[PDB]
Each structure stands twice: as C-alpha cells, then as structure tokens.
Amino acid sequence: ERGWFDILDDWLKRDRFVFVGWSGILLFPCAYLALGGWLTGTTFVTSWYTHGLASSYLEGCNFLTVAVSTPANSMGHSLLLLWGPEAQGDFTRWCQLGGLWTFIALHGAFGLIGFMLRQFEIARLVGVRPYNAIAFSAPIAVFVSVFLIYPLGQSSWFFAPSFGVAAIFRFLLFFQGFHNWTLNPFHMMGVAGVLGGALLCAIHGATVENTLFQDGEGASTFRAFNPTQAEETYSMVTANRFWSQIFGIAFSNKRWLHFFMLFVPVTGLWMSAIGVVGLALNLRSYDFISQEIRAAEDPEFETFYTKNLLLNEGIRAWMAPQDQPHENFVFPEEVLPRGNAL
Amino acid sequence: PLGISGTFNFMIVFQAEHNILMHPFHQLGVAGVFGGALFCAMHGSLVTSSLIRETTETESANYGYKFGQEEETYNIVAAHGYFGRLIFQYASFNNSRSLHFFLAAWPVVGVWFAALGISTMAFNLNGFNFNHSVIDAKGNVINTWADIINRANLGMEVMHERNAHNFPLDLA
Amino acid sequence: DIDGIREPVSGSLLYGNNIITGAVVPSSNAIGLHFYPIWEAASLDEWLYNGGPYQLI
Amino acid sequence: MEPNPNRQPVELNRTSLYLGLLLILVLALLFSSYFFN
C-alpha cells in the first residue's frame, strides 16, 4: 500500500539525468562488466594459450588487432566460471584460459535483456507504444544466434566470434571459406534489409530536408522548427509528387512509411539469424547439386559459382593450420591448392 | 560482374588483393550501412511509438493519417521524452529537421567513404598491413588476428584465376 | 572469355545457370580498357565470346 | 442461430496487394534456385 516495494519503485523511477528503473538493476552491472571486460582484455590480456595469438595493447596490438579471444577448443562449451573447475578461482589462470570471453558474452547477453527491458519500462512510463523494444529484438536475435547458438552447435566456444575488429573480420572470412555464407538466401535477405534500411534512412532524411516548408527567414533552416508545433515541417504532398514522378511510386501515408522503416532492417536481421542457426549445424547453402553434377562430368563448364568454391578451398587449406591450432594440421607444401605461379 | 555470384567473386578477390576489410574507408562504409539500418529502425520505431490515437482496435492505425493533412501525426515531444530517457536528454533530437538531416548524412557520408575506398584501392592504396607486426624478444613472429586474416587472404590469392598467372607477382 | 585465356565462363540461364549463379560476364582481359562496341567486332558471335554485352550494359 | 456479434469485415487495399505480390514474387525468385538445387 505504502511499503518498501513502492518506495523503492519511487526511487528507481525518479526523473534524473540517467534513468535507472527496475530494468537498471540488471542492465547497468551487466553492460558495465561487458564493456569493462572488453576494455580490460583488449588492453592487458593475451590469447597465447588459447589461440597462439597476441591480442592486447600490452603485447603490441593496435585498436584494429586487439581482441578478447574465445577459449581453447578443449574447453568445449564450458561456462568457464571464475570459480569453476577449469580456473578454480585463479583470476590470472582464468584470463589465460579465455574466461573473459564467456564473461563478456554472458554479461553482454543479460545486459541486452536489461536494455530491452529498459525500452519497455520507459515506454510504459511515458505512455508510448513499445515498438522501439520490439525493434531491438533484431539485435538480440543476431547476438544470440551468432555469439551463443552458433558456437553451441559447433565443437566449442572457440568458433564463436572473438570480440575484436580483426577477429570479426577473420569470422567473416571463415564463414565464406567454410560455410559459403554469401550463397545463403537467409544472409542475402539480411543484406537486403541492412542495405535497404540504409537506403530508407538516406532517402527519408533527404526527402524531408528537401521538402521543408519555409518557416523562417534564415538560410540555415534548422531554427525554423519548434518541437511543440502542430503542423508538419515538410510537405508530404510535394514529396509524394516528386517520387511518383521520379521513381513511379511514392509513400502517401506517413504512418506506413515509418512502420516500413522499422520492418525492413528488423526483418533483415531476423532472417540473417535464422541462417546462422543453420550454420551452427553446418547446415549450409554450400552447393548447387545440379552445378556440381554438370561440372564433374564436363571440364569446360564454368560459372562464377564454381570459381567461388575454388576460392573457398584456398581459404580453408591456407587458413586452417593457424586458425585451428588444436587440430595440429600439417599440410605439406605439395598438397596446398594453388593456381599457376601464385 | 553483373550477377549475384559474380558479385561475391569480385568481393573475395578484392579482399585478397587489397585487404579491404582492414581499410578504414570500407570500415566507415560499414558504419554507414549498419548505422543507416540502425537509425532507420530507430526512427521508424520512435515515430510508430508515438502515433496519436485516431483509430479503433479493429482498424489499421495507418488510417489515422490522411495524405496531405496539415497536422503532424505523431507526438515528437513524446518520442523525444522517450528516447532522451532511454539514453540521456541531450543524446536525443528534439528538432525534426536536425534529426532528418542526420538520417540523410550518416548513410550518405559513410557510403561516400565506401565508394572512395573502392576508388582508391583502384590505385592500390590498400588496407592496413600488420603482417608480422608483433615480434618477441628473439625475433619470433607472434601472430595476431591480422596474421590469420592474412592466411585467409593467401588462400584467395593463390586460387583465384588459377590459369591466368605465369609470373610470381599479381601486379594488377 | 573473361580472363582472356580462352577459358569461357558461362553466365546465362540457358547455358546452365540459375538466378544465383547467373551473370552478364565482364569483357575479356585481352581487351583491357579498349572500347569494344558491337561495330568493332567482326561478328556478333565474336562480340559475344569477348564479353561485348558487359561494356554496352 | 442468432448471428455472432464478433464478426468483422476483412480488408486488403490495392497497395497492400501490390506489396504482397512483390514480396511473394521476389521471395520466389530468390528461393527458386535452391528449390531446383
């Protein structure tokens, strides 16, 4: 009625510079620790024992090459808890075994939940509809699919992305060479949603800025807007005529337009995640069987599809020994696939 | 090439030859399109969040807007009230013109850098090369993730256009 | 013959491609940056072998 | 029986038809290669 729960609720929801909320109790520690763990690892922590790599400012890496790298393949999918059976409470050993990777991935996961809870909590307090939270389901689906589901289908967390600029690039190239991920229609739908979203961002911003009403005397036109004004700041009718005449179609309904801006990139991300769930199981779009039957029988038959697989075979042979050290691969010079001269 | 797989071939060979992933102009391009997508979703979600009630539960909210109406159809004050609390107040736009300019500029500028990345790698000023940049006290090479990228790139390089090179260096 | 090595690459649907593998294939490395309009070919068959459609498009 | 008062008419406007047909046709253009394999 007027108890401690309600009093705490009061405090949590004060209108302050940084809103806290009930969601804050989860979000703030988890986000802080994920970010702090990343900065700590990239600054000070090696990947020598897990990958045979230097990965920190301390060892001489730069912003592009530092990473918090995944644990050794031999850890499997161990939670790698500081107090767990691998590190046994030893912070130093924990760092050397890749404990910061699961630390960051798991605090990061709970942090994202906290962020989406925050979006809901704030929306509810201000009295708006929770579409921003709904939209953030896409980043969640990507994070969960790539950082958790993908390695969980594979042998170990080793094969998740390492948290690093160059490390992420390595993850892209791994996916090309091993999964032929460019060929996957779920990735392609991803691409279209991201590029489509970027397109819509650009085109909507430019259209509004180029159909503005003259609402001031200034040549710099930003000051001629008042947040509380009733009227549209740009002409939908002129925008609509322009696009109808240039491109053939145009938006006529502003609510539809802004919904579509949610739908496109959110749907794209969600499709890309579904594909990565298949890659967890090596369930790839690697091949077109009809192409392979023809090419095997007809040594004159060549497409860009066949050309790309040759590239993929190069990637795998040339990168595997150093990228997968636990396999102890030794590939004699003579077995390495190479074209003429190169 | 004018085709889907052809496009991927162009990308993989470009990576082999220019280490585009390590080039800051392609990185700006990525920030441009990932950020364009993010801000697209963000703008869409925030305007959709704040649409003014003009319809009933058994009709599309879209009917609440009529083409060419004078009055704005969402409450920007509410949207800003929301977003400014999500982050903090001065990280949110309360000026629609400034917002819509940012929405234009972010993807456009990033994509201009993407284009300039390709157009300058055209003259073989390539991505950052940190191959063997980290060396121990003896002089042993200590790989970083750049060296692993390098191994992938080598795979691409040695296999591409497998009958076209007669001499050891791919100079164009 | 994209690479000018008399190794022709099939790009069209009727010559064994699907929507994903298909392409209009770049003009030949033998041509380089030379301008290769239809009328510089001895015939449309040559124009086609050498990737003339790419440049026109 | 007395009629059910929960019935509502359903609508699909022309623009939504066109959007829907485009979605379906482009999805088919994309997935068809994979279905033929």
């Binding site: 009718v237 609509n240 109808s244 053939g248 179609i249 145009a250 006529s252 | 009529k66 083409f67 060419g68 109406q69 | 649907l13 009727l14 699907n18 929507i19 | 406007n13 022309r14 623009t15 066109y18 047909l21 485009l22 046709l25 482009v26 088919a28 253009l29 068809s32 033929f36």
Partner: peptide, 30 residues
C-alpha cells in the same frame, strides 16, 4: 523448366511494376 520458371517470375515482377505505377490507387488530399 528451370529457365522458364525464372523468366516467368521475372516477367510477373515486371508486369507488377507496370500495374503498381500506372494502376495505383491514386493518392488523394483531404
């Protein structure tokens, strides 16, 4: 059959563009 199917889908898309442009619901002001 494969080629026919690809070309058919493409040609339907092209027809759709025509109808979506020239036979759109016209936008009307209030």
């Amino acid at each position: 059959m494969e080629t026919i199917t690809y070309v058919f889908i493409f040609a339907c898309i092209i027809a759709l563009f025509f109808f979506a442009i020239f036979f759109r619901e016209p936008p009307r002001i209030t």
